[PDB]
Each structure stands twice: as C-alpha cells, then as structure tokens.
Design a protein around this nucleic acid. Structure first.
Ligand SMILES: [Cl-]
Ligand SMILES: [Cl-]
Ligand SMILES: [Mg+2]
Ligand SMILES: [Mg+2]
Ligand SMILES: [Mg+2]
Ligand SMILES: [Mg+2]
Ligand SMILES: [Mg+2]
Ligand SMILES: [Mg+2]
Ligand SMILES: [Mg+2]
Ligand SMILES: [Mg+2]
Ligand SMILES: [Mg+2]
Ligand SMILES: [Mg+2]
Ligand SMILES: [Mg+2]
Ligand SMILES: [Mg+2]
Ligand code: NA
Ligand code: NA
Ligand code: NA
Ligand code: NA
Ligand code: NA
Ligand code: NA
Ligand code: NA
Ligand code: NA
Ligand code: NA
Ligand code: NA
Ligand code: NA
Ligand code: NA
Ligand code: NA
Ligand SMILES: [Sr+2]
Ligand SMILES: [Sr+2]
Ligand SMILES: [Sr+2]
Ligand SMILES: [Sr+2]
Ligand SMILES: [Sr+2]
Ligand SMILES: [Sr+2]
Ligand SMILES: [Sr+2]
Ligand SMILES: [Sr+2]
Ligand SMILES: [Sr+2]
Ligand SMILES: [Sr+2]
Ligand SMILES: [Sr+2]
Ligand SMILES: [Sr+2]
Ligand SMILES: [Sr+2]
Ligand SMILES: [Sr+2]
Ligand SMILES: [Sr+2]
Ligand SMILES: [Sr+2]
Ligand SMILES: [Sr+2]
Ligand SMILES: [Sr+2]
Ligand SMILES: [Sr+2]
Ligand SMILES: [Sr+2]
Ligand SMILES: [Sr+2]
Ligand SMILES: [Sr+2]
Ligand SMILES: [Sr+2]
Ligand SMILES: [Sr+2]
Ligand SMILES: [Sr+2]
Ligand SMILES: [Sr+2]
Ligand SMILES: [Sr+2]
Ligand SMILES: [Sr+2]
Ligand SMILES: [Sr+2]
Lengths: 46, 82, 143, 56, 81
RNA sequence: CUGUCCCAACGUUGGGCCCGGUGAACUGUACAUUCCAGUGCGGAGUCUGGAGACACCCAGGGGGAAGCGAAGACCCUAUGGA
RNA sequence: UAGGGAAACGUGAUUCAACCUGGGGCCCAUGAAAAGACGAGCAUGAUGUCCGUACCGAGAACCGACACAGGUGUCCAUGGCGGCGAAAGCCAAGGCCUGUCGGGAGCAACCAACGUUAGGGAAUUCGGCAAGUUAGUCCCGUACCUUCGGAAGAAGGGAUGCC
RNA sequence: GUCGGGUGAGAACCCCGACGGCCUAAUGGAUAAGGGUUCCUCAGCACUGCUGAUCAGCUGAGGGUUAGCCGGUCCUAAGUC
RNA sequence: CGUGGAAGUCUGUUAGAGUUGGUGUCCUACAAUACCCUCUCGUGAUCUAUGUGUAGGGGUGAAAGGCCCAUCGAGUCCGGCA
RNA sequence: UAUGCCAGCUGGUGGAUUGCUCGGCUCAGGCGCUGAUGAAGGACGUGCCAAGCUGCGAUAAGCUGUGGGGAGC
C-alpha cells in the first residue's frame, strides 16, 4: 500500500506512543502503558 | 584400545526411514557396555557417522568395524572407523 | 557465537547464495568479530570465508543418447509416447516439402532446363500435392 | 466456497478511514462520506435522537 | 512563524556523509522545500550548498542531506556548533 | 477384474503403551462396590426382600447411568408471529 | 587504454520467448476516450520543486479472535534429463531442515493410511459402495443405429528393449 | 535429521563443519493490496513462541527509507461529486 | 488425393474454474464448511484482478425463496421499548 | 495401616465482611447564548530527560499589564 504524507505522520505518532513509561515517572509517582499496541495483535486506524 | 565389530541388526525394530539414527545410538550403547563407560562419555568420530549414513537414512549396514580407545580420570572413549 | 549475520554479508560480498558460503570451523571467533562488509572482504582474502562451487548437471549420458537417436536408434515403437502428428507436425512437413519443390523448379527455370510453360504445369501439380519429395519430382521430369 | 472463513481472505479493500472533520475511522474513501459525522453529506453534524433513550 | 532548520541530525550515518561525502544532515520543518533548506543553510553557516536531498522520516519530521562545495569542509562546520 | 464375500493372515508407516516437558475442555443435587426379583407416577445403583461384595491402581471395548450435547423441528394448545 | 573478471576475457551454428513486420478467416458480437507527441533546426547556460521509497507479501509480517493445513491479484511459461507437453519422475540455481516438542518398548490390543494374500470369483451389498481391471505409441480391423456430422479409441488382433 | 565443535550458569531444537535429506509455477526471484516499523544493531528472557532457548516477527534502547528521467502527480473510462 | 484449420468439438491435475462418490479423515477440528483420493469444465453463455453501479418490502436472481459481509419466506444497527 | 471420610489447628488461595470516601444520584437557588474578527469539535505539535492526562500553540504546561498574594516555586 501507498501512504500519503498525513498517513505517514499518523503512523509515526502511533509508533512514538508505543514507547514505555520512563523509569523516572515510576520513582516520581512512587509506583503501566495502557495504549500498548502491537503490529500483529492490535489494529490501527485507516 | 581394541577393534570391535558392532552388530546393527536391532535398528530394524525402529521404523525403516529412521534406521541411521538408531544405528548411531546402538554404536554408543555397545561401546559404553563393552568399554565399561557411560554413554555420555563415548565420543564418536564423524567417520562412524558418515559410515552409517552412507546409503541414506533407511539403508544402514548390518555390521561396522570400529576402533576405540579408553583413557582419563573420569573415564571416556574416543572411537573411529577403519 | 552467532555467525548468521555474517553469512548474509558473505553471500552479498562473494555474490553467491547463502547455502554455498563456507566458514572455517577453526576461525569462528574471528568471523564473530566481523561486523562490517570490509571485515568480511578481509576474511575472504585470508581464505577463512570461501564460496563453494555450483553444480552443473552432467550432459554426458544425454550426449551419448543424442548420438544414437541422430543415427536412427532408440526411437522404436516402445520409445514413442506422443502421437504421430505430435512427433512431427504435418503442416510444418508440408512447408518443408513444398518449399523444397518450389526451389528446385525455380532453379531449373533459371538454368533454362524448363520453359515457363513446363514450369507452370509442374508448379501447379506440386501445389496440388502430386510429388512426394524432390526426388519424386525429378523422376517425373525425366519422363 | 463457504461464506465464513474462506470468504474472509478476499478482504483487503480499504473503505473506512480517519476523518478530516471528526477524527473517527468512519470516512468511506469510496463514497467520500463519513458514517459518523456525515462529512461529505452534510454541513451540519450527523446526530440522531435514537442515539439515546427517548426520555434522555 | 516557523523556522526552516530545527536541529542537526547527528548519527553514525550522518558522520559517514560528513567525513567522506562532505554532506551535513539536518532535521528540518516538513513544509520546507529543497530550495528553502539550501538558502537557510547558506544564511546560517556561511557555506555554499550544491545539492539537497530530502526525506519525510517515520518520526514526523523531514530529514535533509545537504552537500557543500569543495571550498567548504563539513567537519569544520559541525565542530563549531 | 478383484480380499466385497467364503475367512481371514502376515507385513508397512503414523498413533496407541512407558519416560521428560507443556497442559485444556465437556460434565458435577447428594450419596454411590453392585446383582437378581419385587415395589413405586406403570422404564430404581439409592425403596423392600434376598444374593454378592477386602481396598487402591493399569489397559480395553462401550452393557447401564431411560449417559453427555439442544427449554421436541413431530402432535396438540395460545381469542401467538410471520 | 568505461565497467567487471583469479583467468581466459571465443568463433560459427541450430531452434528461436521478447521485440519488429506481414497474409488470411469470423461477427444477428464490430472490439475506449482524452491529455500528450509528431509535423517543426542547432549552441551554450539555467531550472527541474512537492509526495511515495524501510520490511513482509504469507503452512509466522495480509483476511480469517491464533505464529489458523483455509482464503488472497500480477510477472519470472525458455535451467538440465525426460516426453507430445507449462505432465510424471529425477536434478541444478536459489531456498530450507520452522507444514517446529522430544526420549523409549520387534514397538501387544485397538485405530488411521497402505502392501501382499492360496483356491473360489460379487457368493458381499439396497446397489460392485470400496478396491481392482484397462492404459502410452504404431499397424491391422471395426457392428446396430444415425439428424450422414457421428457412432469410433466401437469391439477384436498384432507390435513395442538393447546393440 | 546425525556426528563433531562454538557460545553460555544452562543447549535435542542458537551458531560453524561434515554427512543425510526436503522444495522446482514453488518452500526460488520480483511485486499489488493489505499490515505499519514487523527492517538493521546492541542489550535481554518477566511476557509471547504447541517442549527448551543463549534464539526470535517477543521486551528495551538506538539507528534506518536520499530520485528532473521508478511510481504519484497530468489525461480521460464505467461512473461520482 | 492434398491443402485449409472450423468448433458454446474432443483428451488433458497446463494455468485456472468446479465439486460426483468415498456417505473415508476431521467432527471440544488445522478449519463456525477443513484434509485426502476419486470426479467435471478447461477458446468460451469461459475464468480472473481492480475500478464502478443497483439498498431492505427494496436490490440482485439461467429461479434454489438463492444471494445482499458466518445474518435472509424480508439484512444490520440503534430507537420505539421496561 | 495404604488410597481415604468428618471436624479442627498452622500456612496459603480468594476477596466477602467491617470501617473509610477524591465518585455518583436527586433536590434547590443563581445564571445563560457561541460562530466568517473562522465557533464548537478534531488532527498534529509543544517539556532537560515525557508514554498517558491536563495545559498550551512554532512566543506551544506558556508571553505582557493592572490588582491581589507571598517566600517560596
Ligand atoms: Cl504470407
Ligand atoms: Cl512505487
Ligand atoms: Mg522504536
Ligand atoms: Mg492437417
Ligand atoms: Mg523524494
Ligand atoms: Mg419445548
Ligand atoms: Mg408443522
Ligand atoms: Mg398470521
Ligand atoms: Mg507456524
Ligand atoms: Mg484370492
Ligand atoms: Mg445376501
Ligand atoms: Mg467405484
Ligand atoms: Mg542477539
Ligand atoms: Mg466487481
Ligand atoms: Na495489525
Ligand atoms: Na527531533
Ligand atoms: Na487387503
Ligand atoms: Na457404556
Ligand atoms: Na525441455
Ligand atoms: Na524447535
Ligand atoms: Na476439403
Ligand atoms: Na473434492
Ligand atoms: Na456437465
Ligand atoms: Na426489510
Ligand atoms: Na488412588
Ligand atoms: Na449561566
Ligand atoms: Na508526558
Ligand atoms: Sr491478524
Ligand atoms: Sr456456487
Ligand atoms: Sr476484493
Ligand atoms: Sr453527497
Ligand atoms: Sr439531528
Ligand atoms: Sr526513530
Ligand atoms: Sr477408550
Ligand atoms: Sr429448537
Ligand atoms: Sr522464425
Ligand atoms: Sr525495496
Ligand atoms: Sr497459502
Ligand atoms: Sr477450500
Ligand atoms: Sr541446491
Ligand atoms: Sr518451538
Ligand atoms: Sr511377494
Ligand atoms: Sr450382483
Ligand atoms: Sr445378490
Ligand atoms: Sr490392443
Ligand atoms: Sr518476494
Ligand atoms: Sr530463564
Ligand atoms: Sr529479523
Ligand atoms: Sr486526475
Ligand atoms: Sr472444449
Ligand atoms: Sr451422499
Ligand atoms: Sr486429521
Ligand atoms: Sr463437518
Ligand atoms: Sr479411499
Ligand atoms: Sr476436458
Ligand atoms: Sr428495546
């Protein structure tokens, strides 16, 4: 499939959102990413 | 050290297409019994492997002449074909 | 040690298939430190990384058979599998036969052996399928 | 051919996509109409009284 | 108002283009053209740009591979910043 | 023409069986070692009378639990539907 | 006196996909359009922006809740032997040992796939269900019937290797 | 698949060699759709993987897609707005 | 006798399409329609990809009440509705 | 006495119960339009390190003025 410039930006954001909750937030809140999406197991938009 | 003739007729009990695999197990079992060692300690040189697999996985020779040596502290056996 | 990444690189460097690239069993540790394509080329030159020769099917047995068949043997009724017109196309055989008969008659016209009246009589008969071969045509011309 | 599992294999067509107006994956890229907000059909936003219970 | 050059793209592949091909890599604004990326690099670093190659990265940003002239040295321009 | 049959045999491969590892589901009112008769809403492991019965486990082919699965699609009934 | 190759760094031929160009036949069927190009020369110089570009493309990257024995379009249809063949079977190039749990018991009963069974030969069964028989090629030869096309590979008989 | 060997706390199944095999319109090569980072590197084994795993499409962090002349873009088709 | 090469023509696991029998295997499946062998069509009323049109008492239908996203003698969703 | 039955004890498993309430539910009073000067809503951005939420908008968890406030942020 051929992606447009906007579709590319959206897919890019989804990949960035797929990162873990940094080590320092666990220490600041004194002790989980609920938007963990997999390429196979989950489904994106469009 | 001595030269022994290993009978591989008990490989017929195992299915035809897998005869070479069982032959290699029979060789290890024989050398472990006759040389008074553990099966884990018997090292078969690739010459034996190639001898038993020569005509494929199904057509294994009924016998095989093998030269084996016995040495070391724990006790082990290095074996090869002739 | 995991040399699978190097196997892919060696295959591109040597321009050979992955299954044909050989790695020295004694030099596994040196090939493990091979990160780049330049490290691989260095090891190719050292003889540590080599490429096996590709097989080519022997045509010797085929050549012997081609000789017997060219001589007319090994083509008996027990060797034929296809139908008659499959072994030799009848339309192609007529093209071979009639072009040969039309060339023979054109040569005999340019030689002066046959007149434009005799030629026409023989050409039309050839186009009607009166002559089996060129030899059968020559046998009709000579009375 | 079964209407179930073997007919699901031909499903590689893109219809419903992310909408320019509302952000929902309901913009039908062949009809050019959004099934959620009505973009491409109306200037007014698609809303219906049946999307809630009668006395609510 | 948006700026053309966001920041320099400094990775290993960016250094190989700097040491060997005299190319500087930049992360630029996605609305910026090749010609606009060329002008901004000349006006900010006092160099002469020959060719600009762009790519819309999977990070939402635009990466630009900017080749300088032989009078300018890419290693010297990257060292001062 | 032949293992469809008379009439079955031997063999081959994968299972099956034992061992390591992984590891569900169906089903479960309770009790429950049953068998023969009887009785009972007339088709009982459980009531009555007898008989038999030391406990636990392995493999088996499925006689019984009117076995498990599905608020019978037949039939009738409903001031039911289509 | 580009490139590439360790080296040699060939020459002729046959059959010829691609591609080029013609002849014929068929239609109660008649086989796109537009942009563009040609028509309409040459030099030098400048400009040529924007978007896509990773990877999978499947018995694990797609759809089917799954790393699903299903489903899913295109081009490689000219690799060798074989033979009518883009068939079988075997083998290159290339790919793979991931149609991804293993070890053990002449390894019993029973089951799934299957081989061979003397004599009999459909007695089996609703029923030859299942299985089997026949088979490629050439020569000879071929009935009733028929809309004269066909029936027809009717049937039946013979041949078949290698040197 | 087997015999050796490599790495590792740990190896039937991660890697090397040899031997033995499997695939030939495909189990090879290039792609459309569709997927969306699954690609490469390093570090890992709590999760996922029909057993195990040092391996991985898994976990974490980094990196990676460069065009005047390949597509889009332009044209018009059934047809749509 | 040859030439010619017609055909909803024939053989054909060419590609591709289809699905007769086994009432085989499976039947908490590999699979909410699968597997194997067998079998049918394969230059045409042929097969196929993509784009496009027809919408619910309405389509579409070489007609089986077939099909209209595992849903059809009137799709699906929500509402009427407790 | 093995397999095992009943009740309990110690320890699990499980999360009932009791206590707690940053949320709800309902009633009442007050108030009440926004948008081409581009709203509402959405997309994508924006932090030293930032995935979610909130805020914000390339001047991006913020800029200016006045008043309040106060030694913290
Ligand atoms: Cl011609
Ligand atoms: Cl493209
Ligand atoms: Mg990442
Ligand atoms: Mg002819
Ligand atoms: Mg570009
Ligand atoms: Mg009922
Ligand atoms: Mg009735
Ligand atoms: Mg009625
Ligand atoms: Mg798999
Ligand atoms: Mg018999
Ligand atoms: Mg009878
Ligand atoms: Mg039959
Ligand atoms: Mg690694
Ligand atoms: Mg269509
Ligand atoms: Na997905
Ligand atoms: Na950045
Ligand atoms: Na039999
Ligand atoms: Na029973
Ligand atoms: Na050939
Ligand atoms: Na494995
Ligand atoms: Na004629
Ligand atoms: Na079938
Ligand atoms: Na038919
Ligand atoms: Na309706
Ligand atoms: Na017990
Ligand atoms: Na108000
Ligand atoms: Na954040
Ligand atoms: Sr999926
Ligand atoms: Sr059909
Ligand atoms: Sr489709
Ligand atoms: Sr409209
Ligand atoms: Sr409304
Ligand atoms: Sr990145
Ligand atoms: Sr049983
Ligand atoms: Sr019912
Ligand atoms: Sr020619
Ligand atoms: Sr590519
Ligand atoms: Sr497939
Ligand atoms: Sr099927
Ligand atoms: Sr090969
Ligand atoms: Sr596995
Ligand atoms: Sr025999
Ligand atoms: Sr009979
Ligand atoms: Sr009978
Ligand atoms: Sr005959
Ligand atoms: Sr491919
Ligand atoms: Sr571990
Ligand atoms: Sr990988
Ligand atoms: Sr257009
Ligand atoms: Sr035909
Ligand atoms: Sr039937
Ligand atoms: Sr099965
Ligand atoms: Sr079934
Ligand atoms: Sr059968
Ligand atoms: Sr046919
Ligand atoms: Sr309701």
């Amino acid at each position: 499939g051929k992606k447009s410039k906007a579709t590319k930006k959206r897919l890019a954001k989804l990949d960035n959102q797929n990162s873990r909750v940094p080590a320092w937030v666990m220490l600041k809140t004194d002790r989980r990413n609920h938007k963990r999406r997999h390429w196979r197991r989950n489904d994106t938009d469009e | 050290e001595r030269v022994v003739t290993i009978p591989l007729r008990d490989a017929r009990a195992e299915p035809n297409h897998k005869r070479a695999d069982k032959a290699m197990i029979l060789i290890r079992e024989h050398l472990a019994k006759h040389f008074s060692v553990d099966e884990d300690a018997v090292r078969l040189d690739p010459s034996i492997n190639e001898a038993a697999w020569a005509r494929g996985r199904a057509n294994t020779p009924s016998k095989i002449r093998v030269r084996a040596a016995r040495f070391e502290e724990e006790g082990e056996a290095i074996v090869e074909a002739e | 040690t995991d040399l699978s990444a190097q196997k892919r690189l060696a295959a591109d460097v040597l321009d050979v298939g992955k299954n044909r690239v050989w790695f020295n069993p004694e030099r596994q540790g040196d090939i493990a430190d091979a990160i780049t394509r330049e490290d691989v080329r260095e090891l190719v030159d050292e003889g540590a990384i080599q490429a096996k020769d590709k097989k080519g099917n022997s045509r010797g047995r085929a050549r012997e058979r081609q000789k017997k068949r060219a001589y007319g043997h090994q083509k008996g009724a027990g060797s034929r599998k296809g139908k008659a017109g499959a072994r030799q196309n009848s339309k192609e055989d007529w093209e071979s036969r009639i072009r040969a008969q039309r060339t023979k008659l054109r040569e005999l016209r340019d030689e002066g052996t046959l007149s434009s009246s005799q030629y026409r009589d023989l050409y039309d008969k050839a186009g009607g399928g009166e002559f089996d071969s060129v030899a059968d045509l020559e046998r009709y011309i000579d009375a | 051919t079964g209407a179930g599992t073997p007919s699901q294999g031909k499903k590689n067509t893109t219809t419903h996509t992310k909408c320019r107006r509302c952000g929902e994956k309901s913009y039908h890229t062949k009809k050019k109409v959004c099934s959620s907000c009505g973009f491409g059909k109306s200037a007014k936003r698609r809303d219906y009284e049946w999307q809630s219970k009668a006395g609510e | 108002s948006w700026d053309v050059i966001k920041h320099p793209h400094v990775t290993e592949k960016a250094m190989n283009d700097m040491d060997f091909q005299n190319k500087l890599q930049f992360a630029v604004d996605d609305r910026a053209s090749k010609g606009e990326v060329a002008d901004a690099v000349e006006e900010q670093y006092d160099v002469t740009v020959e060719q600009v190659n762009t790519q819309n990265t999977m990070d939402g940003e635009k990466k630009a591979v900017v080749r300088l002239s032989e009078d300018d040295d890419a290693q010297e321009v990257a060292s001062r910043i």
